[PDB]
Design a protein around this ligand. Structure first.
Ligand SMILES: *[C@@H]1O[C@H](CO)[C@@H](O[C@@H]2O[C@H](CO)[C@@H](O[C@@H]3O[C@H](CO)[C@@H](O)[C@H](O)[C@@H]3O)[C@H](O)[C@H]2NC(C)=O)[C@H](O)[C@H]1NC(C)=O
Ligand SMILES: *[C@@H]1O[C@H](CO)[C@@H](O[C@@H]2O[C@H](CO)[C@@H](O[C@@H]3O[C@H](CO)[C@@H](O)[C@H](O)[C@@H]3O)[C@H](O)[C@H]2NC(C)=O)[C@H](O)[C@H]1NC(C)=O
Ligand SMILES: *[C@@H]1O[C@H](CO)[C@@H](O[C@@H]2O[C@H](CO)[C@@H](O[C@@H]3O[C@H](CO)[C@@H](O)[C@H](O)[C@@H]3O)[C@H](O)[C@H]2NC(C)=O)[C@H](O)[C@H]1NC(C)=O
Ligand SMILES: *[C@@H]1O[C@H](CO)[C@@H](O[C@@H]2O[C@H](CO)[C@@H](O[C@@H]3O[C@H](CO)[C@@H](O)[C@H](O)[C@@H]3O)[C@H](O)[C@H]2NC(C)=O)[C@H](O)[C@H]1NC(C)=O
Ligand SMILES: *[C@@H]1O[C@H](CO)[C@@H](O[C@@H]2O[C@H](CO)[C@@H](O[C@@H]3O[C@H](CO)[C@@H](O)[C@H](O)[C@@H]3O)[C@H](O)[C@H]2NC(C)=O)[C@H](O)[C@H]1NC(C)=O
Ligand SMILES: *[C@@H]1O[C@H](CO)[C@@H](O[C@@H]2O[C@H](CO)[C@@H](O[C@@H]3O[C@H](CO)[C@@H](O)[C@H](O)[C@@H]3O)[C@H](O)[C@H]2NC(C)=O)[C@H](O)[C@H]1NC(C)=O
Ligand SMILES: *[C@@H]1O[C@H](CO)[C@@H](O[C@@H]2O[C@H](CO)[C@@H](O[C@@H]3O[C@H](CO)[C@@H](O)[C@H](O)[C@@H]3O)[C@H](O)[C@H]2NC(C)=O)[C@H](O)[C@H]1NC(C)=O
Ligand SMILES: *[C@@H]1O[C@H](CO)[C@@H](O[C@@H]2O[C@H](CO)[C@@H](O[C@@H]3O[C@H](CO)[C@@H](O)[C@H](O)[C@@H]3O)[C@H](O)[C@H]2NC(C)=O)[C@H](O)[C@H]1NC(C)=O
Ligand SMILES: *[C@@H]1O[C@H](CO)[C@@H](O[C@@H]2O[C@H](CO)[C@@H](O[C@@H]3O[C@H](CO)[C@@H](O)[C@H](O)[C@@H]3O)[C@H](O)[C@H]2NC(C)=O)[C@H](O)[C@H]1NC(C)=O
Ligand SMILES: *[C@@H]1O[C@H](CO)[C@@H](O[C@@H]2O[C@H](CO)[C@@H](O[C@@H]3O[C@H](CO)[C@@H](O)[C@H](O)[C@@H]3O)[C@H](O)[C@H]2NC(C)=O)[C@H](O)[C@H]1NC(C)=O
Ligand SMILES: *[C@@H]1O[C@H](CO)[C@@H](O[C@@H]2O[C@H](CO)[C@@H](O[C@@H]3O[C@H](CO)[C@@H](O)[C@H](O)[C@@H]3O)[C@H](O)[C@H]2NC(C)=O)[C@H](O)[C@H]1NC(C)=O
Ligand SMILES: *[C@@H]1O[C@H](CO)[C@@H](O)[C@H](O)[C@H]1NC(C)=O
Ligand SMILES: *[C@@H]1O[C@H](CO)[C@@H](O)[C@H](O)[C@H]1NC(C)=O
Ligand SMILES: *[C@@H]1O[C@H](CO)[C@@H](O)[C@H](O)[C@H]1NC(C)=O
Lengths: 449, 153, 153, 153
């Protein structure tokens, strides 16, 4: 008979989009530094050093980085890995006690208070007078001399972060479970939403590094073609714009105090790391970036924004207006110490369609509270001596405003939100798919009985 | 990199090639559908090794173990579903269900010689739950017809 | 409803009907022996879903996860045992072991036409571990006889 | 005991006997390769059962569950690999790959009549990844030649 018969095939190259739990792998030399000098690697299994792309010839399919599942898995993983890095450490509860205080002496600043209090020895029946330095942001006036408590002490206890565990971000790879594949959009002009015309599969991602920062993002990866700007819609103001640079711009940051740690026994085998003393002069923590290459870099992002906003629209920048400290400032951890800096030195310019450093000041906190989780205070211990960091600023987050009076619709401000879109910066080009290996198709062959 | 016949020695590399030429590479997806678990069983590791206490980060390994049981079980279900059609030994079967050309009007050349498998999927995904029903019944009676023949002799 | 030849389109629905008519349904009792893991794999999940913290009420999920590995492992053991008798591809097999009527004195009609499978189970349950022995040995020598009958080339 | 042909009713019991006589045992190794999980599933139990506090010790039970998912998965991979050579239903296969005696210069008597399987392994473990590649490709074209032999109707 000439008519066709159905024939079944197994292992046909076909897939469909799916939610699936990725598993994380970390590079073996960090893993070989066993028992957690850092978190993640102690659970994040050793990588195969052969990532092995294959170009999926003639393929072309729709990526969407906004609705992507693996950013939400990254966000949820990082929170869980963070908590368990704190869970073995000492609960600092006995420090929530009445403090006598005065300003520091050996200096402009009023930011340091010197405070004295009573604390238990290891022996239950014995307690001592003791003293330490705190920032004006760590303490609240509970009230002759002024009298204080810690800021958190009405709302939660805090955990001291263990000194042996470093906050430095290691590379992390995300790997597909069996019968799923990651896809990678290879196209250097991809904007995060559309049919990517050239793709590879890969078993496991880049070494993504879990930095955390607010107004601008740093040590992450950067596109080779041009400055990329992308958003879930642009025109709707409530959406962020993610900007990724064509080249880094290089920031130096410093804490110029010669800082001294002191140890206090809270109890039988429990100790708290007091700020003991500052030797030499007390001086402000601050960051530098080159005025020339920064001004040039904004000169490039403006030329991109003109593609979306007319021609001679008067594109201009302003500082992060209003709210609390965590929205108003750029924020990060350097070397095991947390920073908050007011970026209005950078975002203060206006543009029309025609050698030395900026220095921006910073402030420090010892207690911190990550992802605004109300009960999860933690206390970061003082770290010894003068410290500094060097970073590549990779890209930045902008937010827009409506027509500012007339002509311009483009007062841009350094944005923010949930930390989740720092992951969407690195995961901008990956997708995950489920293999469907069965197929049925007609041909002119028949079985016999 | 880009073209017909070239990348077939890698997982999925055939996916843009036309259905006829892709039909040679079927063993590669079939093998990698299960044995990719080497990237799990080589490196899943617990207490003392890399970790000490933080005990919820040993019990975090439930994510990796849960992925393994889903992988073996989703694979095993294909071997069941391919088995009841009277076809488990093979990567290819001819079968005695006739192609009802209502499911697609397209002739024998253009399906093998022009389309990719990802394109053919989007047609027959309308009708596939008919076709699986017919395949099951076509075998279910064939088993009985064979038992009668081996008996009446 | 109650009778013969009717509820075969549902799981176990045949069970009170006689062994002859119940021989047609076998694909349903087979398919649902494993694919019912859909009631598990749609919904087994850790915290951060309807759950927030209380992580132990999701590590309690080892109950649901253990039930999955037991299910695939029973299925896979049956498929092994059906394999070593030389019967791996099929829902029915003819086999070269003669029926020793000491295992049941009953005639060919009354077994197929009167009894339910549950009534038959209660007889041959005395002798089943003999019969699995005879099947294994009959196949094992048959593999070697076939190998010689090719080796004479 | 020490001999040839004796302890073949025991797991591994053949291991020192020569490859010929050892070939009768293969069912006993194959059965215990998976069904030995009876020793695990009979006693791996969380709720109650002489234990209702210190339940850290029943989450420490993840070691015993991990060994089960390894065992089913390693076995299932053999059945895949034995499947794609066109050999899934059988303990023994004849196959169309010719033996290149560069893989071993040894004559057909001394391999079956002198050596143990443990002695043979130590030779062929040089060439095994060649022989598996040849078996795969020999089957992969055989499926197509059969599809054409059915298509020339
Ligand atoms: C922060 O407050 C603490 C407590 O009020 C201050 O520490 C105390 O400072 C005084 C001097 O102002 C120290 O006294 C001096 O000690 C040396 C020891 O060799 C002695 O030679 C001097 O004659 C004089 O007695 C005192 O030891 C010191 N500690 C205590 C427990 O009282 C501290 O100065 C304030 N500022 C800073 C930066 O810490
Ligand atoms: C550390 O612990 C000591 C001992 O508990 C505290 O010192 C005591 O503090 C109280 C409250 O300020 C003082 O009480 C006052 O005493 C005077 C004179 O008797 C009286 O006129 C006031 O009305 C009030 O009752 C007390 O004198 C003082 N000293 C002693 C030996 O008890 C201290 O406050 C704790 N904190 C620090 C930072 O040292
Ligand atoms: C990212 O890049 C892609 C292309 O790689 C952009 O795709 C464009 O998406 C818009 C909608 O967002 C499409 O507009 C629609 O076009 C139809 C034409 O029939 C019209 O009827 C609709 O009213 C609407 O205007 C557009 O066609 C599509 N393609 C191109 C080449 O622009 C995507 O918009 C980019 N996203 C961002 C945020 O830059
Ligand atoms: C960030 O940018 C600022 C401003 O360019 C840099 O500050 C400058 O640093 C140098 C070297 O430390 C200072 O020179 C020294 O000044 C003291 C006091 O006059 C003098 O005793 C020394 O012999 C030497 O001349 C310089 O005064 C200072 N300039 C200003 C206006 O503060 C800073 O070093 C840059 N780098 C970092 C990592 O922050
Ligand atoms: C964003 O940029 C604007 C303009 O650079 C900043 O406005 C300035 O804000 C400070 C307070 O943070 C004001 O300081 C004060 O000066 C008045 C006298 O002018 C004094 O009476 C007050 O007691 C206070 O010390 C300042 O007036 C204001 N405007 C100017 C021209 O400096 C704004 O703070 C920036 N916000 C952030 C978070 O970057
Ligand atoms: C962005 O990446 C840079 C480069 O990794 C981070 O800065 C730091 O770079 C220096 C030089 O590699 C590291 O110095 C090392 O410090 C340890 C002691 O902590 C010492 O044993 C070594 O001999 C060496 O001097 C420094 O540790 C590293 N900092 C961190 C926190 O890893 C920079 O921190 C990154 N940016 C951000 C926002 O973290
Ligand atoms: C970082 O944030 C501050 C706001 O907290 C930025 O604004 C500066 O704030 C100071 C007061 O804290 C202003 O000082 C004012 O100077 C006038 C001089 O006529 C004097 O009359 C006032 O009494 C007051 O002292 C300062 O002018 C203001 N900056 C500007 C540009 O106006 C600060 O600018 C931020 N840092 C950077 C690098 O932008
Ligand atoms: C933010 O942008 C504004 C312009 O939109 C900057 O305005 C003015 O800039 C100059 C130079 O930075 C400031 O310095 C003073 O200028 C006068 C000019 O006559 C000169 O005589 C003084 O010796 C001194 O160099 C000036 O205070 C400032 N005026 C105002 C109204 O802000 C502003 O400096 C920018 N701020 C930052 C931190 O970039
Ligand atoms: C990308 O995929 C397309 C198909 O989706 C490939 O295009 C062409 O496909 C046809 C079959 O539909 C091939 O035709 C055959 O070619 C051989 C050798 O030339 C000839 O002997 C046969 O009679 C028949 O004409 C054709 O080769 C193929 N390529 C071209 C250039 O037409 C295409 O191969 C894939 N892309 C690349 C770069 O390979
Ligand atoms: C209830 O189950 C019993 C067995 O547990 C069935 O017993 C007997 O099975 C035979 C089949 O070999 C029945 O013959 C057929 O029955 C149907 C319905 O009565 C009729 O349409 C056919 O023409 C044929 O007679 C037989 O009747 C039945 N009873 C006896 C006494 O032998 C029984 O079939 C089940 N109940 C029903 C109502 O089907
Ligand atoms: C111990 O294992 C060795 C090999 O690891 C066996 O070596 C030789 O195997 C051949 C079989 O091809 C033996 O021939 C047969 O042996 C049995 C038992 O003695 C006998 O009933 C048969 O008539 C026949 O001779 C051979 O004897 C044996 N030795 C030599 C020198 O070739 C060996 O069979 C095993 N030990 C025993 C006691 O079986
Ligand atoms: C510095 O000390 C004086 C006197 O103790 C106090 O009134 C003032 O509030 C202190 N300054 C700050 C900013 O705390
Ligand atoms: C540097 O800044 C000035 C003032 O904002 C501007 O005129 C100039 O164009 C900037 N440099 C470049 C290369 O655009
Ligand atoms: C407007 O801007 C776009 C993008 O920069 C450019 O292609 C176009 O030539 C400009 N047109 C005018 C009239 O300036």
């Amino acid at each position: 008979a000439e008519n066709l018969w159905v024939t079944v095939y197994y292992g046909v190259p076909v897939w469909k989009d799916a939610e699936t739990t990725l598993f994380c792998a970390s590079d073996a030399k960090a893993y070989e530094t066993e028992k957690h000098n850092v978190w993640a690697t102690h659970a994040c299994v050793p990588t195969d050093p052969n990532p092995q792309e294959i170009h999926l010839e003639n393929v072309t399919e729709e990526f969407n980085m906004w609705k992507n599942n693996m950013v939400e898995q990254m966000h949820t993983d990082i929170i869980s890995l963070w908590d368990q890095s704190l869970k073995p450490c000492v609960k600092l509860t006995p420090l929530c006690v009445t403090l006598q205080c005065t300003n520091v002496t050996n200096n402009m600043r009023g930011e340091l208070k010197n405070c004295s209090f009573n604390m238990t020895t290891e022996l239950r029946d014995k307690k001592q007078k003791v003293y330490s330095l705190f920032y004006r942001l760590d303490v609240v006036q509970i009230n002759s001399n002024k009298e204080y408590r810690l800021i958190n002490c009405n709302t939660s206890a805090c955990t001291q972060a263990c000194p042996k565990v470093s906050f430095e971000p290691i590379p992390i790879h995300y790997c597909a479970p069996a019968g799923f594949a990651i896809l990678k959009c290879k196209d250097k002009k991809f904007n995060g939403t559309g049919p990517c015309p050239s793709v590879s599969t890969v078993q496991c991602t880049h070494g993504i590094k879990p930095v955390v920062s607010t107004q601008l993002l740093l040590n992450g990866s950067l596109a080779e073609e041009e400055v990329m700007i992308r958003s879930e819609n642009i025109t709707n103001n409530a959406k962020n714009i993610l900007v990724q640079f064509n080249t880094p711009v290089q920031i130096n940051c410093t804490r110029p105090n010669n800082n001294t740690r002191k140890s206090i026994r809270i109890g039988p085998g429990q100790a708290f790391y007091a700020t003991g003393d500052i030797i030499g002069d007390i001086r402000q923590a601050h960051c530098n970036v080159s005025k020339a290459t920064w001004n040039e870099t904004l000169g490039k992002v403006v030329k991109q924004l003109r593609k979306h906003f007319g021609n001679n629209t008067i594109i201009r920048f302003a500082n992060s207006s209003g709210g609390d400290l965590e929205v108003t400032t750029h924020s990060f951890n350097c070397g095991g110490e947390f920073f908050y800096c007011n970026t209005s030195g950078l975002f203060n310019s206006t543009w029309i369609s025609n050698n030395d450093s900026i220095t921006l000041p910073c402030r420090i906190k010892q207690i911190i509270n990550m992802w605004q989780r109300i009960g999860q205070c933690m206390y970061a211990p003082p770290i010894q001596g003068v410290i500094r960091c060097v970073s590549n600023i990779t890209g930045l987050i902008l937010t827009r405003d409506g027509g500012s009076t007339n002509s311009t619709t483009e007062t841009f401000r350094p944005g923010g939100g949930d930390m989740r879109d720092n992951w969407r910066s690195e995961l901008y080009k990956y997708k995950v798919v489920k293999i469907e290996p069965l197929g049925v198709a007609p041909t002119r062959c028949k079985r016999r009985v | 990199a880009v073209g017909i016949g070239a990348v077939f020695l890698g997982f999925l590399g055939a996916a843009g090639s036309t259905m006829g030429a892709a039909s040679m590479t079927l063993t590669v997806q079939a093998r990698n559908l299960l044995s990719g678990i080497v990237q799990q069983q080589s490196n899943l590791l617990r207490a003392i090794e890399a970790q000490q206490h933080l005990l919820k980060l040993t019990v975090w390994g439930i994510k990796q173990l849960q992925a393994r049981v889903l992988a073996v079980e989703r694979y095993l279900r294909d071997q069941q579903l391919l088995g009841i059609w009277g076809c488990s030994g093979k990567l290819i079967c001819c079968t005695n269900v006739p192609w009802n050309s209502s499911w697609s009007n397209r002739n024998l050349s253009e399906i093998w010689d022009n389309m990719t498998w990802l394109q053919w999927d989007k047609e027959i995904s309308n009708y596939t739950q008919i076709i699986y029903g017919l395949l099951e019944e076509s075998q279910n009676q064939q088993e009985k017809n064979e038992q009668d023949l081996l008996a009446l002799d």
